[PDB]
Design a protein around this ligand. Structure first.
Ligand code: NA
Ligand SMILES: [Pt+2]
Ligand SMILES: [Pt+2]
Ligand SMILES: [Pt+2]
Ligand SMILES: [Pt+2]
Ligand SMILES: [Pt+2]
Length: 129
């Protein structure tokens, strides 16, 4: 499913992302825009053989099992394919664990490079929450 901007923002809040670990909802939406273009099915293979999965492009090296990432962990205890569903619960729950792991949202490279320090509120302006 390709979410609408305000549609994803709605669903992110519902699942508890607004000010999660101090990250306002605008940050989560901007990160999703740039990680996946709001598409729950987005996949992107990394040079290191791991793959990024879903709206927030969660990586198979640490967070999920795809059965092809050598010497990898499944810290979120899911199959990576769960991260591609039109229901974002799994992506959100695994992101809560990532963003708590201690580098906060810097664990999303597109977030550090494109959202961090910007007017993130724009991404939620016009939506109902
Ligand atoms: Na893994
Ligand atoms: Pt939830
Ligand atoms: Pt803020
Ligand atoms: Pt694996
Ligand atoms: Pt939902
Ligand atoms: Pt809207």
């Amino acid at each position: 499913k390709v979410f609408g901007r305000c549609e994803l923002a709605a669903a992110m809040k519902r699942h508890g992302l607004d000010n999660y670990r101090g990250y306002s909802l605008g940050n989560w939406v901007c990160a999703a825009k740039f990680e996946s273009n709001f598409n729950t099915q987005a996949t992107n293979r990394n040079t290191d053989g791991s793959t990024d999965y879903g709206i927030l492009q969660i990586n198979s090296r640490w967070w999920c099992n795809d059965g092809r990432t050598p010497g990898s962990r499944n810290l979120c205890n899911i199959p990576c394919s769960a991260l591609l569903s039109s229901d974002i619960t799994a992506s959100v729950n695994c992101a809560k664990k990532i963003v708590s792991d201690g580098n906060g949202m810097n664990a999303w490279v597109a977030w550090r490079n494109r959202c961090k320090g910007t007017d993130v509120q724009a991404w939620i302006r016009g939506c109902r929450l």
